Every structure is written in structure tokens, then in C-alpha cells.
Design a binder for these strands. Structure first.
Lengths: 56, 345
DNA sequence: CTTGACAAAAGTGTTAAATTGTGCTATACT
């Protein structure tokens, strides 16, 4: 369960940290995560995955 | 039951197929080489960036604040190197991510092989150390086996791991089991002794003697040496060890105190000091002062010859003659009163 | 009370022996 966010130029976010809806994902503010959850940066698929969970 | 708890906890995490194993090892090595390449990038040490990445991985604030109250500051030396590694071009960045993933893989690998360790530690009981302790030493030996492993040799990691777990548990028996500390060498020595003793006790039909076991031990081994090593081998005895069928007595409370002066002893020393003080007073002032300078009756220390000569302004020989004379005068008066003729033990 | 001469005792600095601590091993093994 997650929301996918493909990128192009590098990444701001790193594997394992926390993001809130509207927060800035990769490509200098091109893509944002609209959902609460932990974020994993995937090299092979060139993507930023946001798995919904609460930081508790 | 803690054993049930841990066993179930590791029962949760599944095993690893050959594919998973090889892939994880690969990702780990890639992570490490990424750390080295980053060491060529920003010019900082491997374990530095490594422990930083860990600090970003296996917990946020908890890795820093409690390995003891003082290590490397949270807002300061952790975050500044973090931000310094943040400010690099794309390749070094993707290598940062790769490094992190490597660390994670290391963790998982560690878990499945924790199941392995549990098997091995299950083999080693009877120790002088508890089961869970065995498990944990073996687990450290496991982290160790994970670190130095090479998948390129195409060997199942289980074997390499097993050796390291085993050696770690033996390090436990060596460093732990006996109340008193006996270092590795004599531990192995004692083990060999007991083993051989068992062997020739099986052969001869009876327990050996120090001579025959020493000869069975080879060169450099005599009766006194095996007797000595056996003397070291023996364990202390619990002070609470019950004595007789009585429930009111221990072993430890039958132990006397020789460290503490008995009333009779304090009174004896008192009478000695006093009677000596009075037997001293009949001497000349100077010779008495000299004597009590020699004895430690003043500052407690022992003032030689020259020191006394320096304090009274005379030569040391004079001091010598003085004390001899004093001694003999005391010989007379004591030959009379017989008050100090005791204390002779 | 003194002085000088001497060896025995207690010191002081570099070395050898043994002593102890640490790491490593790869069929596979959970």
C-alpha cells in the first residue's frame, strides 16, 4: 500500500524519513506527496514511494 | 519466559533463500565500497560516514544519547557531517542511498542468521553461563561473521557464520563462566588437562596421578605444574552454602575476621605503647627523641642515621652509639621491673 | 662527639622471558 512518485533530477528526500501531504519530493519541487507516510527512494525504478503510515 | 519471547521473536522473521542471501551480500559490499568512494569524495574516514548512516538508519536520536552519556553531539558533529554529505553532486548521492540500503540488508541477514546462532548456542549449554548469554555472544559473533563475509567464494554463509559463532561462545566461557577471571590460555590448558584425564581414566580404569597425566601431556609437564594448574582451576564456594541439615546456618558466617583488631589486641597495643612510653622516659631526653625518630613514633616514617644527624646537627655515628646505649639502659631497667618482658609472643 | 674507609643494602635504568589479550579459520549447518 503506497503512492508512487517517479522523478527525474536527483532527489531531496532520503530513504526512511518522514513526509506530510504537500511536502517537497524530488526534482526541486516538481512532485509533492499528497499523503502521510514513510518515504523510500528507489534507484532502479527511478521513483519515490510513499507508504502510508503515521509517524507514531 | 524470556527464552520463549526471543525464540518467538526470531521465529517471526523468516529464512533466506539462496537468491536473497547472495543479493543481500552483494548489496552490503556495494554499500561498503560506496562508503570508501565517499571517503574519496569528501575526504573522511569509512567508519565515520558508516556510523553516520547508521545514526540515520537504526534510530533517530537513540544511537547518540545513550551509549554512555558522552559520545558525539547530536546537533553538532552528527548533523554537520550529514549536511556536508548532503551538498554533493548526483553520483555521490546515489552512492549515499546505496550505502544506506547496504546497511539495512546487513541488518536482515543478521536476523535470519540469528535463528542460526540460536541453534549453535543451543548446542553449547552446561557452561557456567546462561542460555540467553550464549545466544547473545553468538549474535555478536554473527554480526562479526556478517561483516567479513565474501559471497564471491560461492560458499553458503552458514558455515563461515558457524565458525565465528562458535569462537564467540568460547570467548564467552573463557571471559565469563568462572567467578574469578581466568584468561584464555590457561582455560584451554585446563580443558586439555581434564580431557586427557578423562581419556586415560577410561583407559586405565581408574583416575591418574599427577605424574602419569603429566607424561601423557607431553614435554614440559610435571606433577607440580598439573597440580598448580588444577589449583587454579578450582572455583570459589558460595558463602550462602548451607551447613548441615539446619536451615539457620550458612557457610559464610562461620568465617572469622582477622582484618579487624580484637579488643584484647587493641588493649595489648595500648598497654605496649604506654608501658614503652614510661620505660622510655627514664632515658636522657636526646637519646629518647633519637630512638622515637628511628622507630616511627613521631611521623610514623623511619628516619635513618644521616637524617637524625641532620636534625640534631651532629654526625650519624654519634646517633648510632646513642641508640645502642639507650637499648642497654632499657636492658637494665626492664631486667628489673619485668613489665615489658612480655609482648614477646 | 668526629672522620674516613668499606661493604651490604637498597636503587635505578635497559632487557629478556613469560604472560595475557585479540583475532582468525570457507562442505554445510538456521
Amino acid at each position: 500500500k503506497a503512492r508512487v512518485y517517479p522523478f527525474e533530477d536527483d532527489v531531496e528526500v532520503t530513504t526512511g524519513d518522514r513526509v506530510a501531504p504537500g511536502d517537497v519530493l524530488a526534482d526541486g519541487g516538481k512532485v509533492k506527496s499528497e499523503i502521510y507516510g514513510r518515504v523510500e527512494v528507489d534507484l532502479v525504478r527511478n521513483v519515490v514511494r510513499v507508504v502510508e503510515s503515521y509517524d507514531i | 519466559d524470556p527464552v520463549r519471547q526471543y525464540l518467538h521473536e526470531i521465529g517471526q522473521v523468516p529464512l533466506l533463500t539462496l537468491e536473497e542471501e547472495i543479493d543481500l551480500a552483494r548489496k552490503v559490499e556495494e554499500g561498503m565500497e560506496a562508503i570508501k568512494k565517499l571517503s574519496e569524495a569528501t575526504g573522511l574516514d569509512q567508519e565515520l560516514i558508516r556510523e553516520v548512516v547508521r545514526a540515520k538508519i537504526l534510530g533517530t536520536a537513540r544511537i547518540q544519547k545513550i551509549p554512555g552519556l558522552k559520545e558525539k553531539p547530536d546537533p553538532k558533529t552528527v548533523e554537520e557531517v550529514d549536511g556536508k554529505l548532503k551538498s554533493l553532486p548526483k553520483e555521490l548521492k546515489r552512492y549515499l542511498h546505496i550505502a544506506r540500503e547496504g546497511e539495512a540488508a546487513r541488518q536482515h541477514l543478521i536476523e535470519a542468521n540469528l535463528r542460526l546462532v540460536v541453534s549453535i548456542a543451543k548446542k553449547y549449554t552446561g557452561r557456567g553461563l546462561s542460555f540467553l548469554d550464549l545466544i547473545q555472544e553468538g549474535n555478536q559473533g554473527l554480526i562479526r561473521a556478517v561483516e567479513k563475509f565474501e559471497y564471491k567464494r560461492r560458499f553458503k554463509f552458514s558455515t563461515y557464520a558457524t565458525w565465528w559463532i562458535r569462537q564467540a561462545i568460547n570467548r564467552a566461557i573463557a571471559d565469563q563462566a568462572r567467578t574469578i577471571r581466568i584468561p584464555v590460555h590457561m582455560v584451554e590448558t585446563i580443558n586439555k588437562l581434564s580431557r586427557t584425564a578423562r581419556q586415560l581414566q577410561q583407559e586405565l580404569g581408574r583416575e591418574p596421578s599427577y605424574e602419569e597425566i603429566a607424561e601423557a601431556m607431553g614435554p614440559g609437564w610435571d606433577a607440580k605444574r598439573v597440580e598448580e594448574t588444577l589449583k587454579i582451576a578450582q572455583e570459589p564456594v558460595s558463602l550462602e552454602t548451607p551447613i548441615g541439615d539446619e536451615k539457620d546456618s550458612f557457610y559464610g558466617d562461620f568465617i572469622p575476621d582477622e582484618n579487624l583488631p580484637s579488643p584484647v589486641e587493641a588493649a595489648a597495643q595500648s598497654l605496649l605503647s604506654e608501658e614503652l612510653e614510661k620505660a622510655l622516659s627514664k632515658l636522657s631526653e636526646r637519646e629518647a627523641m633519637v630512638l622515637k625518630l628511628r622507630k616511627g613514633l613521631i611521623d610514623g616514617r623511619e628516619h635513618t642515621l644521616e637524617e637524625v644527624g641532620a636534625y640534631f646537627g651532629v654526625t650519624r655515628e654519634r646517633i648510632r652509639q646513642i641508640e645502642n646505649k639507650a637499648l642497654r639502659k632499657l636492658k637494665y631497667h626492664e631486667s628489673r621491673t619485668r613489665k615489658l618482658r612480655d609482648f614477646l609472643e
